[PDB]
């Protein structure tokens, strides 16, 4: 059932996905936004678009609909063009991860372009290094200097020149196992830092609420004075700590000067001895906290769904396929395994390749979440 299942299951799923993934991913190609901050997303857009454009020939080939010439064209061109785009898409995910790590965890790294990294230079260099410097086999795949191999069948292994593709397809995996492991350090360091920032904010607001309660229960000038001093210290500490968090909380540095304002006023109303009126001023801060957490819980949702969006897609699209490939090559080397297990594992490999190519349809999630200009364009569309 090896010859019939692949047209039945893999081909059907791929044909279902081609009509939707490219249609959903071609929207971001306009990019009437950004200049030197988002361009990594646009590079992923173009790589994904080329992926989906090259997809249809795969179903044309593996389903037996195309002739031997179509199979040869698929082997020589479509497979390589899809692979190079997928393995540059993973690299560009890793580069977005690098930007996210560098711009939130430590202040400066410096580069030839911009403060975080040379976005334009890296974007120009990575695609050039991937297209031909990583897979020279584009014109060097002129069959095995001979066609007419199993007629329409066995129209893939036909390649001359020691078939260096085997060397080129291992490294394509190997660099991924760097990028993936990179995401084990870029992200994870970006979760510890974010969690520390949120814990610092929560502790500051805890002590702020405690001192506000002390003010509401206070009796003379000394208690109000001490509580407002502690609350001002907490407000300043929270203002400083919020700057070390995610960039999706910029207004947090812009509203605290109001909070730390009214405490100061209340402070002047406690120092001067007017404790009985000072309390009233601190009562206004009770409306500050209610007006703050109502946004805080609204933005910690936004950050967590953003900072964990990419690590979601990368861990659902590309990682499962690279896990599944290891037994495939291992049992290619170890022929002692059963051939039925070989067939089932081939089915698993092609299904995981479909899952990885589903990053084309899953990338609109990243476009909608991580890009505020994309949100504005979608709203105004």
């Amino acid at each position, epitope marked *: 059932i090896t010859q019939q299942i692949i047209p039945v299951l893999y081909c059907m799923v791929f044909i279902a996905g081609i009509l939707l993934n490219g249609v959903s991913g071609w929207i971001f190609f306009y990019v009437p936004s950004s200049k030197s901050f988002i361009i990594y997303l646009k590079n992923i857009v173009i790589a994904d678009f080329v992926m989906s454009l090259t997809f249809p020939f795969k179903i044309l080939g593996d389903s037996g609909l195309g002739p031997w010439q179509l199979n040869v064209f698929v082997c020589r061109v479509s497979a390589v063009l899809f692979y190079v785009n997928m393995y540059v898409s993973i690299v560009f995910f890793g580069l977005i991860s690098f930007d996210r790590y560098y711009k939130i965890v430590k202040p400066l790294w410096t580069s030839f372009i911009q403060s975080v990294s040379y976005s334009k230079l890296l974007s120009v260099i990575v695609w050039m290094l991937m297209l031909l410097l990583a897979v020279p086999n584009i014109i060097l795949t002129n069959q095995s200097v001979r066609e007419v191999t199993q007629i329409k069948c066995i129209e893939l292994k036909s390649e001359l020149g020691r078939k260096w593709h085997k060397a080129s397809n291992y490294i394509f995996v190997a660099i991924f196992w760097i990028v993936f492991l990179l995401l084990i350090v870029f992200y994870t360091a970006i979760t510890k830092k974010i969690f520390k920032s949120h814990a610092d904010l929560e502790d500051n607001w805890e002590t702020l609420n405690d001192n506000l309660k002390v003010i509401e229960k206070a009796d003379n000038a000394a208690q109000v004075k001490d509580a407002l001093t502690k609350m001002r210290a907490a407000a300043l500490d929270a203002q400083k700590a919020s700057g070390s968090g995610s960039p999706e909380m910029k207004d947090f540095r*812009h*509203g605290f*000067d*109001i*909070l730390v*304002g*009214q405490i*100061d*006023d*209340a*402070l*002047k*109303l406690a120092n*001067e001895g007017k404790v009985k009126e000072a309390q*009233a*001023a601190a*009562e*206004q*801060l009770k*409306t*500050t906290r*209610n*007006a703050y957490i*109502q946004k805080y819980l609204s933005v910690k949702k936004k950050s967590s769904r953003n900072i964990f969006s990419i690590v979601f897609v990368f861990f659902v699209c590309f990682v499962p396929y690279h896990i599944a490939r290891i037994p495939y090559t291992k049992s290619q080397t170890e022929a002692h395994y059963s051939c039925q297990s070989k067939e089932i594992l081939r089915y698993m490999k092609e299904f995981t390749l479909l899952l990885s190519a589903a990053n084309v349809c899953l990338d609109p999630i990243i476009y909608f979440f991580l890009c505020q200009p994309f949100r504005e364009i979608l709203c105004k569309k």
Partner: antibody
Amino acid sequence: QLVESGGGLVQPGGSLRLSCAASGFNIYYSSMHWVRQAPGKGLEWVASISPYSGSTYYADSVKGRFTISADTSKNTAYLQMNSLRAEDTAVYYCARPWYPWSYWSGLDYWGQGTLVTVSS
Amino acid sequence: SLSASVGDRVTITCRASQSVSSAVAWYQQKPGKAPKLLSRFSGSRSGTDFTLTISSLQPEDFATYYCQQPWSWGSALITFGQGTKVEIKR
């Protein structure tokens, strides 16, 4: 009661100091706000100062360009506008809440308002 | 802008996403004068909406009404609404 003065025709990019003199109370134990109403438009809050503690708040549209200070000796709140743009044309009202923190009421007491026209 | 004749009950609605207590100040600016902070005038709330009800209109109540949208008081930040103008029905 609050009386504003100093409004008039100024060219774009110029500076102007509107003086809101307060009568019947001292501005030290108070907070003075400026609310500008563009011709035919709704009210817009501009700046606020609490001379007791010295805290000063600004609208996001005018932060830095304007500067509000107070002088309790003359009992006057001065809004100094620098780098005035064409959209700064408006009637500026000097509002003052009942309490310096206003409790909940809002800008209870308002001035007569004075016109500022920024046109070349 | 809305229209209502003398003696009609009127409801002016201001939109704000805050869910804090109804500490929304309503200003009645008669044309050509400074605004006035606001027994017929009564406050109310309906979800995200803050409502000013005039039980019985009077000839001096045909003015523009501005709310001070919620979160208008950590001491300062006074975001007035776009204003509802009450006219005559004729």
